[PDB]
Symmetry: D3
Subunit: 269 residues, 6 copies
């Protein structure tokens, strides 16, 4: 339904108190977090991370929000990573973990540079829609640092072990077509259409149930995150269980102050 | 502890029709019991025994009156002393025990040895008689179980003990098994079935969906994507329960 | 060479008593399981699953069969998903995984939803140019709770797997091939012809090496369950060695085994 | 070290301002204590309780004076009996990823959700009156998360299945024998021994402790554990000369030059 | 991109003394090159070849002037065609040694990389392939198999469907097919093989060697369970010793870590 | 088995030539013994020690007459008190080497097994402890740690609660505490340490060496991801070469014909 998918978008500002980001919510349930430091190619400082964390937590808790977009202000940079001129030092690890465990899809909308710490951010997002002017890569080894967490292992789950080793060991830059060919982004679109198409992808997700998306994200995370992934799966299993008769017999027994009785339930194969 | 209920007599009905090597019985309150019936060879299994255990366990899984399965051997001297369709069909039976959404309880008197030892380990719980004897024999007899018999064993008793069990192939008495965490409890032989049934009945009073989910969650810590498949299966069944 | 590989195939019917599928075997060792409900786009119901489980176990135990083909009747659909209990398909999926013989999905037209997970569980997928792939259904149950997801990510990678599940788009044969979902794409008219060639290439090779490698590749995904498969092959091999046989012979004749006769390899 | 040092009295300083369900206290030698303060309901948590615990634990993580955190319940009869009558999953992760040791100090009941919380703490010091168990399946609930798999890494697969499938209660001696708690002490000595254990860890390198905690989580938590462990490697690297060359070169308006560093074996 | 530096001539100093099956050479700017030198038998390895390769690689590892290693075959027709038709299976030790080597190892491939030879190139961190390169396994064809990193690790490179295809059918794949499935990092004209390989090597050589070893361990740790944890944590242990807090522990008089910040 | 056999005298033959920091000996019934010989420093290892141990273990591995290795310290007071604090971390190589050795490696511990020395006993497949044995880490006290197998693998031995205790507090534990937590396999009187150790080795030596290497790899595989699969699969490969179908490849090459697998049976 292209009319629906490409219908205009109505953004409402929710940036009060924020210095380094914009936070906006659409009427049809997309939240957008925008890194707003274009003069340093949207590099994050610890303050910027703090604000993103708060913005993301809000979006996670807002039942009107079904999908989150992460992006950079302007056309030239998504995020260039940590600010080199120096709310603590490595708080971006918290943010990474927050994106990871967020029960709603998070979409990186990338124009221009997604580099270093900013490249790991887009990879952490469930999906990435890249503009044709997008540029990708790591810089760690070039400037004597590294991300050996999800920035390494999860990257390898996206593009394979050979490419991951290439990306990190050389620290080259890769354009949008290259990113696309190695499986690094989901699609490449003309710069002028970047949000239009990103919003279309969001609305296609919004057609599916929130619970289904939550279960699917947890299952895919679970292939990577061991017991932390199992814990995500179980939380969803607990939520599902509460919505069934058998999972309500506990509470209903405690209402009528009687001992629970599970004898009336089928023992399925 | 409503022990009068827990310790009440059991109404067993026979379902052993067509089986040569095993007995298969069901109780009205939801226990199925699969008994290896070859006491002359200390309840060692052949491919036929295994084929029949697979049938009986598939029957118990599909009977919605059955909540818990008991695996055991005939008589007082042997749970199962190892292996004598095809040669290694016990591997199928291991998988089937593992993925059975119902608790499976090994009720062990005397020898649980070799292939027979792996079987009791595969069961969710083990209730042992004070005359129970445990251990592997593979390396002593030119064989080994490097599957769940190795790795899953380590998840029960720890890497040091697992290596001891496999490399030396000693026998271990009931107290030794208890102390290393190999079995869940030791009871006097005369009370073996009585306590086993009490344990089954305590589980039968609990949410069967809860047990099913928890068994898969605990398996998921070992079985990688096969474990995740179990969890996803449960999430689906939960959803179709609305 | 091409002469052998593209020779005519002689199918013998083994469909006796099956309502929802056809089951056939070639003289040269290929078994073919065909979902036979093209009137409903080859969607399966619990009976279809039960029959397929039966057919597969037959193929597994048939010492003349080396490779299994799974496919749908007609040209329009491989399998469009589900609607002998409600979720027995999950058992059939595991039986495919643990089958010590290669299983090949032969896909024409739709491979959708539960039907899409099916082709993915197969070791290889041969796709016709009219093939269409994708997941479906807004609700958890229509996703089977993401049953299939982790393994799909081992095929197409995490970004594309999240795309496939979260948006539920459809993909054509070229798109499937470019992301690694299928092994090759061939003209619809050449589908069986190419599939049989692929099967015949596998049939030329060591069946024991095939089962060991399949178990080995599964073991990267399936934790201890994979170790059980892989180790069970080692045990099967060990029994076929002299050191294995000395240990057994000693136990029978009730003596101590002399293993010193065998070298302690480094 | 010194037993006199280890068993010196402890001066708790109240930090509970704006908390309704919990008390939060700090000692001068570096211990934070979070007490569930609902003894009337056997220290069960309601969502407010969990919310305040998250806050306090966040505070403690950020207080450079704190090296070790104690989680406990008020009075002598209960540590935590689980949810009243899903932010607790958030609190569980927060305990897991806290770079400082977290010690469950258990008197009486640690039950249901309250049992998962003690297991999530790095160490458990149990009083002789302590009772442990799950209740989920008895009451139509279950924790298939860390409550299951991590439990199995503590007591083994046979015991974890028994605990979950039957939902019995276990006394302190039983918990100790299956490796569920670290030590059992007389109830009167519970805090005295716990503070001793905390002070022992406080004597050690905090960096070493956080690296080890991450290393141990990493045996359970796949790439999430790698993230914790690699995060620490990255932090350490910043404290080395080679790790500062990047930042130095930039501040010196020049190209990084790593040729000046050893290429170790 | 300083292509003058990157494409500058390279001078190999010979370190091959005492080697029968291989050549071992070093450049001044820090590249070690191990060349399988059995072109009579298409560069197939025997136990002695493996033993020498292990020696050469251990030398590269302990040479503080070496930052990257190139593994390659002599001549233009074969990188390595596999095992000859320490001990028999010693190639397994070489594979582990490539894996735990704290310096990048690059397979430079011309012509055949087949069988045990194909697993060799996969074990290397990167593979630069000539346009005449050919890849594939042969195990099932000749009744053997590599079920180790030869199977699982291949799957982390090309994906599960492709890995099953490669092993089950044992076809050969040309340079473009290898590139399209992510099996090699790049494909260049045969005449430029060493030129491009040296450029890639020089690019890594400009970067932090500590950073590279840490990321290599981190990437291995996604496959190798506790063995991966050992490498990763071993690097952490090494970094920790280089800090004041680590050094204070050594000097400790009982140690005092009170003067160090408890970071969040 | 026969206790007369198991407790027969043991005869150690010296193979220590060239070694400065260790002794290395072999018995004729197939046991190699590597003894850290620095008792004046409680058998602490320095890099030289580790290098010699690696060399000795490599020899034990390639010696077809050796089926089991004992790792031990000289005298009665120490197994190994850890890294000598007076290349740098070559002990990690030794750790991997103990791990991937296809023969059982048994730690024989009298007195202190501490720090890096405590990780060494854990790496061994089995540990036989004397009644005077003492165990524990020290890293955090002296500003260091082993977060590799020293942490994760210890957790597979004692469980996550005890592992955290051991590492976070760095206490010492006696032989009884060690046995109770599953850290050692058995505790024996000091005077019988070698006697019982040699008994255990001889029990293993009666079993199939192939079965033992396969099981060791299988048990490593529960911990070591693809590195463990490499070991396990490497054994499968070796087993395959000893079967007729596994020999067809080489027979076909020798007889100058294409391999033919049609003549072999398929199994379910
Ligand atoms: Cl970076
Ligand atoms: Cl056995
Ligand atoms: Cl509970
Ligand atoms: Cl091969
Ligand atoms: Cl993994
Ligand atoms: Cl230490």
């Amino acid at each position: 339904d292209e009319a629906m998918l490409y219908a205009p978008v109505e953004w409402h500002d929710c940036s009060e108190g924020f210095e380094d980001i914009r936070y906006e919510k659409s009427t049809d349930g997309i939240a957008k977090i925008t890194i707003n430091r274009p003069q340093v190619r949207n590099a994050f400082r610890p303050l910027t991370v703090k604000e993103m964390i708060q913005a993301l937590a809000d979006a996670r808790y807002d039942d009107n929000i079904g999908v989150i977009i992460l992006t950079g202000a302007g056309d030239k940079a998504f995020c260039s990573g940590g600010d080199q001129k120096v709310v603590h030092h490595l708080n971006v690890l918290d943010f990474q973990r927050q994106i990871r465990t967020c029960p709603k899809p998070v979409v990186a909308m990338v124009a221009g540079y997604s580099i270093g710490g900013g490249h790991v951010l887009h990879m952490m997002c469930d999906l990435t829609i890249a503009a044709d002017n997008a540029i990708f890569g790591q810089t760690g080894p070039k400037v004597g640092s590294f991300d050996g967490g999800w920035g390494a292992s999860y990257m390898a789950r996206i593009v394979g072990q050979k490419k991951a080793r290439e990306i990190w060991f050389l620290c080259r830059q890769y354009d949008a077509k290259q990113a696309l060919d190695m499986g690094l982004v989901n699609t490449v679109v003309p710069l002028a259409d970047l949000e239009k198409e990103t919003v279309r992808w969001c609305r296609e997700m919004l057609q599916n149930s929130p619970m289904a998306l939550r279960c699917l994200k947890a299952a895919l995370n679970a292939d990577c995150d061991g017991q932390a992934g199992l814990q995500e799966l179980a939380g969803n299993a607990t939520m599902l269980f509460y919505m069934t008769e058998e999972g309500q017999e506990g509470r209903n027994a405690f209402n009528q102050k009687r001992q629970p009785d599970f004898s009336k339930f089928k023992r399925n194969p």
